Design a protein around this ligand. Structure first.
Ligand SMILES: CC(=O)NC[C@H]1C[C@H](n2cc(-c3cccc(OCc4ccccc4)c3)c3c(N)ncnc32)C1
Ligand SMILES: [Ca+2]
Length: 450
């Protein structure tokens, strides 16, 4: 409120797009301490509670400390944004580390879940519920195999409204507790979500699955699942018993996070065959989720580029006094600053110094029409290379193609209607039942107006 964020911190690099907003690697201008700042835009996110309830939870969260909980250092608020400043972790997402290794057993799964439960138990004792616990929120403290897990976004859910855009809801339906869907829930919803993560660690397949978001939510609401897949034969009976207690439908009957640590499976496997079939399915699952996410962000970046391309052309056309199509470097900065003044402050461009530098980078490469193409191509370049990398990673056999069955699974996770993508495919392809990267990219372009 009183203190300004930009006067203390400077943006160094974009870490990624998390829940509620963009995540930026920032650095203190005095001490040089690196920090990860989640920037939540007030227009794209609505406040569920009042301002005084939010400040009270922020104050509590700043005093909490646990080795498996991400530390919240500071909190800032300006006219249109909320900035949540915390510690940086470079180890990446838990599931990205599991797909790289060749050996994964119940001892590794028990060591993972013991950490997740230690953090949850500690936060539940302080009356803080996560509500949106999922593998994406489990980060590794360092780039190593024996590194600590840190749970992020612990306590946001209660004060910020969930996004309705599929690019942000991707992969959430698998882990949500049934009682969260019907409205009456408490801290037991985090035990269910951890139970779902444990089920995926030991088999590589979600317990509640479907061809789309709604079919998954129907399975979660019914609450029925089975240990009827071949890979569950090589898993112990105590692991299955803990999952049964964690995935109990009635929350009052469901085990607590505290009692889940004292369970025989945690006590025996933290104080042993390799689950090879489970690794292959986590690889397939992670690749499928990441390609679906990359496809949705690619379409979103193409629509954002079209909006900003025309908006920046209109700003520069009005600034062109004589009408030769040219402008000075100082004029282009005024017009680029006007784009952020009209279409909101950018996550990468925190202050005027970052805008002046962003223009100098485009001016070094590059008529304002040519400059418009470069500045917009730089924003699309960050999204097109992620799509190709995700397509290449999904294509594990390096065939260069993805089958029609794989497209149905991808578009199913992305929530693109079955009849809509099949029609778009016939317009570009026109019939081997498989598409290459360019054809896949052409389908996404046609699925967002281009
Ligand atoms: C993706 N990503 C998101 C975070 C991150 C950044 C800032 C805040 C955040 O969670 C907000 C929070 C943390 C603790 C309590 C309440 C909210 C998570 C983050 C991080 N710190 N380090 C590496 N990757 C990260
Ligand atoms: Ca292939």
């Amino acid at each position: 409120s009183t203190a300004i964020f930009s006067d203390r911190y400077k943006g160094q690099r974009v870490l990624g797009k998390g829940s509620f907003g963009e995540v930026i690697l920032c650095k203190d201008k005095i001490t040089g301490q690196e920090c990860a700042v989640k920037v939540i835009s007030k227009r794209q996110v609505k406040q569920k509670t009042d301002k005084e309830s939010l400040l009270r939870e922020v104050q509590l969260l700043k005093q909490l400390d646990h080795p498996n909980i991400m530390k919240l250092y500071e909190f800032f608020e300006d006219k249109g944004y909320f900035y949540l400043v915390g510690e940086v972790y470079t180890g990446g997402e838990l599931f990205d580390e599991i797909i790289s290794r060749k050996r994964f057993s119940e001892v590794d799964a028990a060591r993972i879940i013991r950490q997740v439960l230690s953090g949850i138990t500690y936060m539940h004792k302080n009356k803080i519920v996560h509500r949106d616990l999922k593998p994406e929120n489990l980060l590794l403290e360092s780039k190593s195999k024996d590194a600590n897990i840190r749970i992020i976004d612990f306590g946001l859910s209660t004060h910020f409204e969930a996004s309705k855009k599929m690019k942000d809801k991707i992969g959430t339906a698998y882990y949500i507790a049934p009682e969260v869907l019907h409205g009456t829930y408490d801290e037991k919803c985090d035990v269910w979500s951890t139970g779902v993560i444990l089920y995926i660690l030991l088999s590589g397949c979600p317990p509640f699955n479907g061809a789309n978001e709604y079919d998954i939510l129907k399975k979660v609401e019914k609450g029925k699942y089975t240990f009827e897949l071949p890979q569950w034969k090589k898993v112990s009976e105590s692991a299955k018993d803990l999952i049964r207690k964690m995935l109990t439908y009635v929350p009052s009957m469901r085990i607590s996070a505290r009692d889940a640590l004292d369970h025989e499976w945690i006590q025996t496997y933290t104080k042993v065959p390799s689950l090879d079939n489970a690794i292959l399915n986590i690889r397939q699952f992670q690749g499928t989720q990441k390609l679906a996410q990359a496809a949705l962000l690619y379409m979103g970046s193409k629509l954002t580029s079209q909006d900003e391309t025309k908006e920046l052309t209109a700003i520069f056309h009005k600034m062109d006094k004589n009408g030769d199509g040219q402008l000075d470097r100082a004029e282009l900065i005024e017009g680029y600053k006007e784009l952020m003044r009209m279409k909101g402050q950018d996550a990468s461009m925190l202050d005027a110094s970052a805008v002046e530098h962003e223009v100098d980078q485009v001016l070094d490469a590059v008529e304002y029409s040519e400059f418009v193409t470069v500045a917009m191509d730089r924003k699309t370049l960050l999204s097109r290379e992620r799509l190709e990398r995700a397509f290449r990673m999904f294509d594990s056999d390096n065939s260069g193609k993805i089958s029609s069955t794989e497209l149905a699974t991808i578009f199913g996770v992305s929530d693109v209607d079955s009849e809509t993508w099949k029609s778009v495919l016939s317009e570009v392809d026109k019939n081997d039942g498989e598409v290459d990267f360019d054809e896949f990219q052409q389908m996404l372009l046609k699925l967002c107006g281009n």
